[PDB]
Amino acid sequence: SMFLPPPECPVFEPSWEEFADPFAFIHKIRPIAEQTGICKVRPPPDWQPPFACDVDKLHFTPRIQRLNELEAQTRVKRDYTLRTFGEMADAFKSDYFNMPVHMVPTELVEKEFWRLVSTIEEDVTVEYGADIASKEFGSGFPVRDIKLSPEEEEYLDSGWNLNNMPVMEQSVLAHITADICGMKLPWLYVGMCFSSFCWHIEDHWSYSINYLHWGEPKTWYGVPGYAAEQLENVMKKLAPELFVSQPDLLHQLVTIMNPNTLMTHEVPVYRTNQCAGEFVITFPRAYHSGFNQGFNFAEAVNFCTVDWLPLGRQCVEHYRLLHRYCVFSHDEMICKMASKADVLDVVVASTVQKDMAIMIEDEKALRETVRKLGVIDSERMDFELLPDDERQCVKCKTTCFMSAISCSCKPGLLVCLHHVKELCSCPPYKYKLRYRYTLDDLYPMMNALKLRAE
Numbered sequence: 001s002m003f004l005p006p007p008e009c010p011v012f013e014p015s016w017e018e019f020a021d022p023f024a025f026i027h028k029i030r031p032i033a034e035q036t037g038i039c040k041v042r043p044p045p046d047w048q049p050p051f052a053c054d055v056d057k058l059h060f061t062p063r064i065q066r067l068n069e070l071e072a073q074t075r076v077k078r079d080y081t082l083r084t085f086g087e088m089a090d091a092f093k094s095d096y097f098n099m100p101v102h103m104v105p106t107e108l109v110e111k112e113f114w115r116l117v118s119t120i121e122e123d124v125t126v127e128y129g130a131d132i133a134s135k136e137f138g139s140g141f142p143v144r145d146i147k148l149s150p151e152e153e154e155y156l157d158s159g160w161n162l163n164n165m166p167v168m169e170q171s172v173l174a175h176i177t178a179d180i181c182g183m184k185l186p187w188l189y190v191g192m193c194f195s196s197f198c199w200h201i202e203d204h205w206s207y208s209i210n211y212l213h214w215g216e217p218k219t220w221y222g223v224p225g226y227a228a229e230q231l232e233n234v235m236k237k238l239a240p241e242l243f244v245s246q247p248d249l250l251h252q253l254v255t256i257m258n259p260n261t262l263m264t265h266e267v268p269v270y271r272t273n274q275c276a277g278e279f280v281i282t283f284p285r286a287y288h289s290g291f292n293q294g295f296n297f298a299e300a301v302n303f304c305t306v307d308w309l310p311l312g313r314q315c316v317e318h319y320r321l322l323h324r325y326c327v328f329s330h331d332e333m334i335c336k337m338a339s340k341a342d343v344l345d346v347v348v349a350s351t352v353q354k355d356m357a358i359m360i361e362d363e364k365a366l367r368e369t370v371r372k373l374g375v376i377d378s379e380r381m382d383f384e385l386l387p388d389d390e391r392q393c394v395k396c397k398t399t400c401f402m403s404a405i406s407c408s409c410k411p412g413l414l415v416c417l418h419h420v421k422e423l424c425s426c427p428p429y430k431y432k433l434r435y436r437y438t439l440d441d442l443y444p445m446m447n448a449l450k451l452r453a454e
């Protein structure tokens with residue numbers, strides 16, 4: 001009645017042995033955790049990274065949040081110090097319940113959250129912080145520079161230090177040269193009671209890993225990747241405004257929605273309370289949302305393993321159908337790894353090889369199709385030198401890299417090879433095929449990968 005909590009997600013407690021390598025561990029739990037979308041990881045008892053900062057010298061500009069179910073909010077984007085925010089947050093919670101701030105049971109904040117977001121008479125607003133690390137506000141993990149204490153140095157090179165996570169070698173987003181600060185740098189979240197993150201999946205269907213440094217718990221709802229489209233159909237029916245096309249990546253619309261609504265429509269949902277010192281991991285295309293119990297501080301980062309590579313290609317195809325902007329070119333990333341085949345991990349090399357073989361076979365078919373449409377002229381073109389906004393398909397907005405069609409009639413404009421009929425009204429003999437590599441360039445790049453993989 002009123003609120004029925006979803007069943008709990010899996011909780012893992014690895015030994016020091018299992019915990020040593022994050023990628024081997026995540027691959028171990030994957031068959032379990034991918035069935036629930038999220039999972040929680042409790043580190044070994046002595047793994048305790050030092051948190052230290054001056055609460056007075058850390059400044060940030062907060063976002064204001066209206067808490068209404070099914071109401072549209074924008075995904076990304078006054079002045080508080082950590083101390084002044086903390087004082088505002090604690091007084092807010094304390095006055096809301098007329099209780100000392102942690103005699104308030106977690107079960108009660110949860111059912112109160114879902115009551116207040118559904119009730120139209122209530123117009124509660126709250127605030128929070130969301131930002132990547134900078135000089136005014138940096139990582140909660142130790143980083144290099146300032147002399148460090150011997151304990152900080154122990155955790156400088158930890159796999160679970162989230163600054164290191166992207167640039168490790170079993171990560172694929174590693175050697176991407178193109179800037180993607182949005183999804184390779186860690187984000188910092190300063191929470192208060194009821195501040196919340198709307199339902200979403202990560203860019204390019206990547207994993208994420210989330211660490212709560214300190215403070216009151218963070219409550220999570222997660223849906224497995226196989227049910228992503230079920231959830232979207234439920235949401236399209238109850239709030240179609242979120243699904244109208246939007247002009248860019250800075251205009252993605254998201255919302256709050258009761259898990260019981262999803263469970264009623266046969267969408268599997270799981271929950272957890274994440275406490276300080278614990279990790280939450282989200283899997284590819286796993287929807288998630290949640291809210292904070294009180295004043296707290298969390299840090300999160302995207303990442304991509306070799307397991308993810310095929311899904312990443314399916315995702316870009318899915319973006320094309322929806323006319324959504326990409327954050328980077330998936331093909332450009334494959335070719336960059338191929339060109340560095342000699343210094344790649346051998347498991348990586350083998351998995352890149354398989355994706356590249358698919359890429360090449362698809363590119364062959366596409367070029368044959370545009371040739372039969374009467375496009376004859378062609379010229380090599382270094383797509384990776386163009387700013388992203390200068391190489392999106394006019395029709396489907398995909399970021400071009402392997403090839404595109406241009407016409408002297410519309411200078412600067414491009415379409416991908418799926419949308420040759422959408423560029424202009426000139427006859428096809430006036431078009432040029434622009435390509436990064438000939439098929440003959442590509443087969444030796446793939447062979448280099450096969451040799452490295454043996």
Ligand SMILES: O=C(O)C1CCNCC1
Nearest residue numbers: 189196197210218298300
């Ligand atoms: O505020 C937060 O904790 C989150 C935001 C986005 N994804 C997951 C968690």
Ligand SMILES: [Cl-]
Nearest residue numbers: 067116119122
């Ligand atoms: Cl409300």
Ligand SMILES: [Mn+2]
Nearest residue numbers: 200201202208
């Ligand atoms: Mn997220």
Ligand SMILES: [Zn+2]
Nearest residue numbers: 407409424426
């Ligand atoms: Zn033309």
Ligand SMILES: [Zn+2]
Nearest residue numbers: 393396416419
């Ligand atoms: Zn296109």
